[PDB]
Design an enzyme around this catalytic site. Structure first.
Site, PDB file in Angstrom:
ATOM      1  N   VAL A 179      -6.737  -7.831 -19.888  1.00 58.71           N
ATOM      2  CA  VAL A 179      -5.848  -7.438 -18.796  1.00 58.71           C
ATOM      3  C   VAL A 179      -4.720  -6.563 -19.330  1.00 58.71           C
ATOM      4  O   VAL A 179      -4.042  -6.908 -20.309  1.00 58.71           O
ATOM      5  CB  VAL A 179      -5.312  -8.681 -18.065  1.00 58.71           C
ATOM      6  CG1 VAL A 179      -4.283  -8.297 -16.984  1.00 58.71           C
ATOM      7  CG2 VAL A 179      -6.461  -9.465 -17.451  1.00 58.71           C
ATOM      8  N   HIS A 189       0.119   0.057 -13.327  1.00 62.53           N
ATOM      9  CA  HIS A 189       0.908  -1.051 -13.837  1.00 62.53           C
ATOM     10  C   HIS A 189       2.321  -0.539 -14.055  1.00 62.53           C
ATOM     11  O   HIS A 189       2.506   0.575 -14.595  1.00 62.53           O
ATOM     12  CB  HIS A 189       0.315  -1.606 -15.137  1.00 62.53           C
ATOM     13  CG  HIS A 189       1.120  -2.721 -15.744  1.00 62.53           C
ATOM     14  ND1 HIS A 189       1.163  -3.990 -15.203  1.00 62.53           N
ATOM     15  CD2 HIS A 189       1.921  -2.763 -16.839  1.00 62.53           C
ATOM     16  CE1 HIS A 189       1.941  -4.762 -15.940  1.00 62.53           C
ATOM     17  NE2 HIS A 189       2.422  -4.040 -16.934  1.00 62.53           N
ATOM     18  N   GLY A 209       0.776  -1.223   0.000  1.00 58.62           N
ATOM     19  CA  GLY A 209       0.000   0.000   0.000  1.00 58.62           C
ATOM     20  C   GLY A 209       0.810   1.276   0.000  1.00 58.62           C
ATOM     21  O   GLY A 209       0.401   2.258   0.620  1.00 58.62           O
ATOM     22  N   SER A 210       1.966   1.293  -0.662  1.00 62.12           N
ATOM     23  CA  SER A 210       2.676   2.553  -0.824  1.00 62.12           C
ATOM     24  C   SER A 210       1.995   3.424  -1.865  1.00 62.12           C
ATOM     25  O   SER A 210       2.027   4.658  -1.766  1.00 62.12           O
ATOM     26  CB  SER A 210       4.129   2.294  -1.206  1.00 62.12           C
ATOM     27  OG  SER A 210       4.272   2.090  -2.595  1.00 62.12           O
ATOM     28  N   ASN A 211       1.357   2.799  -2.853  1.00 65.18           N
ATOM     29  CA  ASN A 211       0.473   3.544  -3.732  1.00 65.18           C
ATOM     30  C   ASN A 211      -0.734   4.068  -2.968  1.00 65.18           C
ATOM     31  O   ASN A 211      -1.075   5.251  -3.065  1.00 65.18           O
ATOM     32  CB  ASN A 211       0.049   2.663  -4.893  1.00 65.18           C
ATOM     33  CG  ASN A 211       1.042   2.697  -6.023  1.00 65.18           C
ATOM     34  OD1 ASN A 211       1.524   3.760  -6.412  1.00 65.18           O
ATOM     35  ND2 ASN A 211       1.369   1.533  -6.548  1.00 65.18           N
ATOM     36  N   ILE A 214      -7.665 -11.154 -10.714  1.00 64.64           N
ATOM     37  CA  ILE A 214      -8.302 -10.762 -11.963  1.00 64.64           C
ATOM     38  C   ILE A 214      -9.808 -10.733 -11.754  1.00 64.64           C
ATOM     39  O   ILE A 214     -10.396 -11.665 -11.187  1.00 64.64           O
ATOM     40  CB  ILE A 214      -7.909 -11.707 -13.106  1.00 64.64           C
ATOM     41  CG1 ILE A 214      -6.401 -11.705 -13.283  1.00 64.64           C
ATOM     42  CG2 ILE A 214      -8.512 -11.230 -14.409  1.00 64.64           C
ATOM     43  CD1 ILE A 214      -5.814 -10.301 -13.447  1.00 64.64           C
TER      44      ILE A 214
HETATM   45  N1  LIG Z   1     -10.174  -7.760 -16.597  1.00 66.00           N
HETATM   46  C1  LIG Z   1      -9.158  -7.295 -15.677  1.00 66.00           C
HETATM   47  N2  LIG Z   1      -9.206  -7.727 -14.422  1.00 66.00           N
HETATM   48  C2  LIG Z   1      -8.270  -7.315 -13.524  1.00 66.00           C
HETATM   49  C3  LIG Z   1      -8.016  -7.559 -12.139  1.00 66.00           C
HETATM   50  C4  LIG Z   1      -6.879  -6.829 -11.789  1.00 66.00           C
HETATM   51  N3  LIG Z   1      -6.471  -6.191 -12.870  1.00 66.00           N
HETATM   52  C5  LIG Z   1      -5.319  -5.323 -12.960  1.00 66.00           C
HETATM   53  C6  LIG Z   1      -4.081  -6.187 -13.149  1.00 66.00           C
HETATM   54  C7  LIG Z   1      -3.708  -6.844 -11.822  1.00 66.00           C
HETATM   55  C8  LIG Z   1      -2.285  -7.388 -11.850  1.00 66.00           C
HETATM   56  C9  LIG Z   1      -2.226  -8.752 -12.519  1.00 66.00           C
HETATM   57  C10 LIG Z   1      -1.880  -8.933 -13.868  1.00 66.00           C
HETATM   58  S1  LIG Z   1      -1.948 -10.599 -14.156  1.00 66.00           S
HETATM   59  C11 LIG Z   1      -2.411 -11.115 -12.616  1.00 66.00           C
HETATM   60  C12 LIG Z   1      -2.669 -12.549 -12.162  1.00 66.00           C
HETATM   61  O1  LIG Z   1      -1.997 -13.417 -12.587  1.00 66.00           O
HETATM   62  N4  LIG Z   1      -3.733 -12.843 -11.218  1.00 66.00           N
HETATM   63  C13 LIG Z   1      -3.985 -14.202 -10.782  1.00 66.00           C
HETATM   64  C14 LIG Z   1      -3.809 -14.268  -9.275  1.00 66.00           C
HETATM   65  C15 LIG Z   1      -2.352 -14.206  -8.837  1.00 66.00           C
HETATM   66  C16 LIG Z   1      -2.272 -14.194  -7.315  1.00 66.00           C
HETATM   67  O2  LIG Z   1      -3.338 -14.704  -6.556  1.00 66.00           O
HETATM   68  O3  LIG Z   1      -1.137 -13.662  -6.694  1.00 66.00           O
HETATM   69  C17 LIG Z   1      -5.427 -14.603 -11.072  1.00 66.00           C
HETATM   70  O4  LIG Z   1      -6.477 -13.881 -10.491  1.00 66.00           O
HETATM   71  O5  LIG Z   1      -5.697 -15.704 -11.905  1.00 66.00           O
HETATM   72  C18 LIG Z   1      -2.525  -9.968 -11.822  1.00 66.00           C
HETATM   73  F1  LIG Z   1      -2.882 -10.039 -10.508  1.00 66.00           F
HETATM   74  C19 LIG Z   1      -7.275  -6.455 -13.929  1.00 66.00           C
HETATM   75  C20 LIG Z   1      -7.263  -6.019 -15.290  1.00 66.00           C
HETATM   76  O6  LIG Z   1      -6.253  -5.141 -15.722  1.00 66.00           O
HETATM   77  N5  LIG Z   1      -8.214  -6.457 -16.120  1.00 66.00           N
HETATM   78  N1  LIG Z   2       1.086  -6.608 -12.380  1.00 61.03           N
HETATM   79  C1  LIG Z   2       0.545  -5.667 -11.426  1.00 61.03           C
HETATM   80  C2  LIG Z   2       1.601  -5.138 -10.499  1.00 61.03           C
HETATM   81  O1  LIG Z   2       2.592  -5.817 -10.234  1.00 61.03           O
HETATM   82  N2  LIG Z   2       1.355  -3.923  -9.981  1.00 61.03           N
HETATM   83  C3  LIG Z   2       2.375  -3.359  -9.113  1.00 61.03           C
HETATM   84  O2  LIG Z   2       2.156  -3.615  -7.689  1.00 61.03           O
HETATM   85  C4  LIG Z   2       2.743  -2.615  -6.823  1.00 61.03           C
HETATM   86  C5  LIG Z   2       1.886  -2.067  -5.674  1.00 61.03           C
HETATM   87  O3  LIG Z   2       2.750  -1.565  -4.629  1.00 61.03           O
HETATM   88  P1  LIG Z   2       2.193  -0.990  -3.221  1.00 61.03           P
HETATM   89  O4  LIG Z   2       1.503  -2.187  -2.610  1.00 61.03           O
HETATM   90  O5  LIG Z   2       3.405  -0.574  -2.413  1.00 61.03           O
HETATM   91  O6  LIG Z   2       1.260   0.150  -3.621  1.00 61.03           O
HETATM   92  C6  LIG Z   2       3.227  -1.553  -7.824  1.00 61.03           C
HETATM   93  O7  LIG Z   2       4.658  -1.585  -7.884  1.00 61.03           O
HETATM   94  C7  LIG Z   2       2.648  -1.851  -9.219  1.00 61.03           C
HETATM   95  O8  LIG Z   2       3.539  -1.442 -10.259  1.00 61.03           O
END
Ligand SMILES: Nc1nc2ccn(CCCCc3csc(C(=O)N[C@@H](CCC(=O)O)C(=O)O)c3F)c2c(=O)[nH]1
Ligand SMILES: NCC(=O)N[C@@H]1O[C@H](COP(=O)([O-])[O-])[C@@H](O)[C@H]1O
Length: 200
Positions: A143, A108, A11-13, A91
């Site tokens: 995604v 991202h 949660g630094s973001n 996701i």
């Molecule tokens: N449609 C849509 N949905 C969502 C939901 C979040 N995002 C933003 C991207 C998030 C980062 C992310 C990129 S790939 C991935 C992943 O492999 N997730 C696994 C679980 C891995 C785990 O439990 O550590 C899964 O849920 O299968 C990620 F977590 C989006 C999006 O951009 N589009």
């Molecule tokens: N593929 C998605 C992904 O890796 N997102 C990444 O997670 C971090 C959140 O950091 P925070 O928990 O310190 O805010 C960020 O570095 C962002 O680029």
């Protein structure tokens, strides 16, 4: 605008966003922080800021859609207008993404369309770019294939590792994410009817 922030870890973001929305000219208001993993530091920065926290466990729902619905109930409970994904590693299902189309932002750590996916820094380093960065975009059903709001480039120094590259990118994240939220909360930026970014 009433805003929810979904986290999974540090949660630094989230902290960066908290700091900006506390500013008097913020168009944004962080009304709920939701995390899929309990006992993560984002839940502290939130509590330390006096923001309600809610933990919804993806590992306790039979369906991904049952799990998203858990979240939507809270989003509706807190009358949220905008959803910020700040390190959220689950996701979301199609209908949920469709429901919040144009109302959900993601950070991202790459200059999209490059290095889509979860290990962007790893990808960047294997490829050998000298310039990377971060992207704030609208979440779409593809995604990391949604409409881009802000981007900031960051240099890859030689001998970088995930640890150091990501330290440097995160500083940029902490800039463009609050900026992007403010753009959308103020209605300066929206998702045009034609589905591209619309300035106003
Ligand atoms: N449609 C849509 N949905 C969502 C939901 C979040 N995002 C933003 C991207 C998030 C980062 C992310 C990129 S790939 C991935 C992943 O492999 N997730 C696994 C679980 C891995 C785990 O439990 O550590 C899964 O849920 O299968 C990620 F977590 C989006 C999006 O951009 N589009
Ligand atoms: N593929 C998605 C992904 O890796 N997102 C990444 O997670 C971090 C959140 O950091 P925070 O928990 O310190 O805010 C960020 O570095 C962002 O680029």
């Amino acid at each position: 605008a009433r805003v929810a922030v979904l986290i999974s870890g540090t949660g630094s973001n989230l902290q960066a966003l908290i700091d900006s929305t506390r500013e008097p000219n913020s168009s944004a208001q962080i009304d709920i922080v939701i995390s899929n993993k309990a006992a993560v530091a984002g839940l502290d920065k939130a509590e330390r800021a006096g923001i309600p926290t809610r933990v919804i466990n993806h590992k306790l729902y039979k369906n991904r859609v049952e799990f998203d619905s858990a979240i939507d109930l809270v989003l509706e409970e807190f009358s949220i207008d905008i959803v910020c994904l700040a390190g959220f590693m689950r996701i979301l299902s199609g209908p949920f993404v469709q429901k919040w189309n144009g109302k959900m932002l993601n950070i991202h750590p790459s200059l999209l369309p490059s290095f889509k996916g979860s290990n962007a820094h790893e990808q960047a380093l294997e490829t050998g770019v000298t310039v990377t960065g971060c992207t704030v975009h609208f979440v779409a059903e593809d995604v990391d294939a949604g409409q881009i709001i802000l981007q900031e480039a960051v240099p890859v120094k030689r001998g970088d590792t995930v640890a150091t590259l990501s330290e440097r990118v995160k500083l940029a994240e902490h800039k463009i994410f609050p900026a992007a939220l403010q753009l959308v909360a103020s209605g300066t930026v929206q998702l045009g009817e034609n589905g591209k970014i619309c300035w106003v």
